Amino acid sequence: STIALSEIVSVVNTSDGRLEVFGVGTDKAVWHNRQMAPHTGSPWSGWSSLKGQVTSKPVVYINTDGRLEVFARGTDNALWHIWQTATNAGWSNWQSLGGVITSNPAIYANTDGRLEVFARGADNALWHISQTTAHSGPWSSWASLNGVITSNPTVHINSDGRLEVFARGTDNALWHIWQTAPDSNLWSSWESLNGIITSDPVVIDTADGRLEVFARGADNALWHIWQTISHWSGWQSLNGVITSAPAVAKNCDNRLEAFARGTDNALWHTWQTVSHSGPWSSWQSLNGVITSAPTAVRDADGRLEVFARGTDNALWLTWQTASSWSPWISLGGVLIDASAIK
């Protein structure tokens, strides 16, 4: 009935290459903050409200026309959304997509540009709904993929265009289910990848087109598992002792880099050395005192930026410099953890 502490924001690279973060304020509204300019260390806009009243982490996704769209569980437990009405410009009103959900929503674009949203239902199964045409309503009917899940779901597209969803099962193993063809409503059966996981799964598509899943294990280390050929391996440990969900992102050269809170409440990281096919470093501290999981993203200068909530409940930020990382700086605001599953 427990997962590692969640991320405090959802992040996206905008149509024009800037970082934009979304989180939940003390009023339960979705707020957001963005870089002025597409560069590491740009000034930030400060927090502005998109209003609403939410009961999940708000999750941003960029439509294939560049319009941001934010999905969140509402006060009636329906899936709600709000979208830019023109690329990188004004926002709509909040609208309901109905349903009854009991997790944070997870989103990906099909190969046809239709966004598809996945979330745990009132029956604890995985449900989904999608745009009927590319980056546009109306939306489909809600449909079930069955199963019984106990984490937030995570979706990613394979290198052949098939969506695949990952979630913790009732035996605490990592389970997954996939599209049998791109854009399809036909899916495989649920299948177990075994292991024990104690966080939401984090899924990345490698430079060589293989899905790779990261999760906290029963021993509180960071573990991972991967497809052996483009579109599985044994579970393998990357060690560490982590007190939050992990975050993973790709460097300029596609080397993966994993971030998580330590038992000292500092941010810690481990990275692939040499290349995207290389072995992982041992862990190193990036300091700070943080009160959420980190959120990691590559910016328009090819530099990793990491966000995490601080002891004052503001969002703080550190990034890669030529040969080190920048001192933690505050972006202000007061953010709450509204994750539907804690």
Next chain:
Amino acid sequence: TIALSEIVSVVNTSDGRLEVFGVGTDKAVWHNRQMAPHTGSPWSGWSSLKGQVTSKPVVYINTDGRLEVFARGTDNALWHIWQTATNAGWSNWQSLGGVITSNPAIYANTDGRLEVFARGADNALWHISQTTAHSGPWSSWASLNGVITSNPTVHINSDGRLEVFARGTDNALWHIWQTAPDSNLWSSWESLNGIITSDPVVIDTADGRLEVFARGADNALWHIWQTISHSGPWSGWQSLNGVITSAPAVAKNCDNRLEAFARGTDNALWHTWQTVSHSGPWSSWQSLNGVITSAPTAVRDADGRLEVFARGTDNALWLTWQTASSWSPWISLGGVLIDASAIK
């Protein structure tokens, strides 16, 4: 007349390997691909996809990861061949009909439907598209009018609208765009002025602005750009100097710094690059040596390094890439390639 063309079409496959496509002495399409997703990977060697082509062959990756090659045939129709699956074999060559007079230019709409553009016998711009994402059947051909004198170049805007560029009859750079993503409604043709003496090369910058590169009347490398993400007004033309004897090729370093490549007056490969960051000033031109007989083709590999291909004095495809501090010694991938560009 246009500056000497690129000799190959290159792509980063869905599993992170570079794959190049060219025309052999037999007029067939040949290809060569990295075994591994890394700078300096060994190569397959040249093998034939057959066909007899009469344009540059142009590869594009469908949104399901399957490569698809487009080329003009001996009957002047558009022809194509595609992978049946991402790491499987190829279809037979199949005709999309029409009669075309340029190399094809391809881009995916926001709905995953490929759209192909080519000049017609009337010298207008024509187009045809997949009816559903990454799949046949295709639409009927239709015209976007105009009178064009180079190969066309297409790129998607950061708001999803396709936009096509081509030299006009006054030798200026002209363009035309979708009014909405996935749409069959387009703007009128509009001039961006200047004089161009190569095909246009079009990039979408890290900040979502289309930027076009072309050789000028003075044989320098020139460029012009949208000043606002997916929007006019455009800049005026600006020179990046140099004196170039081929079409330019442009690619993004992993940090998004643009880098332009072209054959020099000494027939070596030369380049100029943005300094500091993706909105910084360009360097002076510097030589990467070699003696080349086509325009270069530049592409960022799965290690985030630039790799540049060009035909050599023996008509083989040669290759140099970025290393930590410099560039690798030119190396040969063999083969014998011809310039089959439908417009020269």
